[PDB]
C-alpha cells in the first residue's frame, strides 16, 4: 500500500511515534520514505538470505520469521508477513524495539544517511495532524 506522506505521518502519530525515544515524527517519515518509499509490500533480499520487510524495512535475520534464514533470532515474535500489510501497527511495534536499543534510529542506514542532520520537520510541514 503506497502511503501518503501525511496519511503515513497521521498514522504513526496515532500509533504513537512522535518523540518516541526523543525522535520527532519526521524522523519516522523520512526513514520510511528513504526506507520503502512508503510501500508496505516493498521487499529487499540481501547477501545473507536475509530479507528486509515492509515500510521501515525490518530484517528477517534479527527481528522476524519469513520462513528461511540459515540461522538467527526473531527479536519481535512476528512472522515477517505482518510487516507486510496495510496497517502499520506491527512495523511500528517492531520498530520501537529496534530503536529501544543503544544506537536508536541508527539501525536504518537511510535515516542515518538521508535523515540524520536534515529538517525532518520538512517531512510533516503541510500536514493534517
Q: Which DSSP string do the residues of the chain spell out, in sequence order? A: -BPPHHHHHHHHHHTT-TTBTTB-HHHHHHHHHHHTSSBSS-EEE-SSS-EEETTTTEETTTSEE-S--SS---TT-EEGGGSSSS--TTHHHHHHHHTTSTTGGGG-HHHHHHTTTS-SGGGTTT---
Q: Of 7, 35, 66, 87, which is the active-site residue?
A: 35
Would residue 35 show up in a list of annotated catalytic residues for this protein? yes
Task: Find how far residue 127's CA is from the centre of its chain.
Answer: 20
Do the Cβ atoms of 70 and 46 come closer than 8 Å? no
Whole-angstrom distance, CA of residue 15 vs CA of residue 67: 28
Whole-angstrom distance, CA of residue 47 vs CA of residue 29: 27
In order of start, what are the domains of the chain with their CATH numbers?
1-129 (1.10.530.10)
Would residue 18 show up in a list of annotated catalytic residues for this protein? no
Q: Kindly report the length of the chain.
A: 129
List of residues 6+ apart from 21 with CB closer than 8 A:
96, 99, 100, 104, 105
Q: Of 7, 18, 48, 52, which is the active-site residue?
A: 52
Amino acid at each position: 500500500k503506497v502511503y501518503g506522506r501525511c496519511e503515513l505521518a497521521a498514522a504513526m502519530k496515532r500509533l504513537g511515534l512522535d518523540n518516541y525515544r526523543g525522535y520527532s515524527l519526521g524522523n519516522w517519515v523520512c526513514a520510511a520514505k528513504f526506507e520503502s518509499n512508503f510501500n508496505t509490500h516493498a521487499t529487499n533480499r540481501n547477501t545473507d538470505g536475509s530479507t528486509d520487510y515492509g515500510i521501515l524495512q525490518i530484517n528477517s535475520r534479527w527481528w522476524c520469521n519469513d520462513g528461511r534464514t540459515p540461522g538467527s533470532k526473531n527479536l519481535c515474535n512476528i512472522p515477517c508477513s505482518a510487516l507486510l500489510s496495510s496497517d502499520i501497527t506491527a512495523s511500528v511495534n517492531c520498530a520501537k524495539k529496534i530503536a529501544s536499543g543503544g544506537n536508536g534510529m541508527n539501525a536504518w542506514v537511510a535515516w542515518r544517511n538521508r535523515c540524520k542532520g536534515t529538517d525532518v520537520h520538512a517531512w510533516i510541514r503541510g500536514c493534517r495532524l
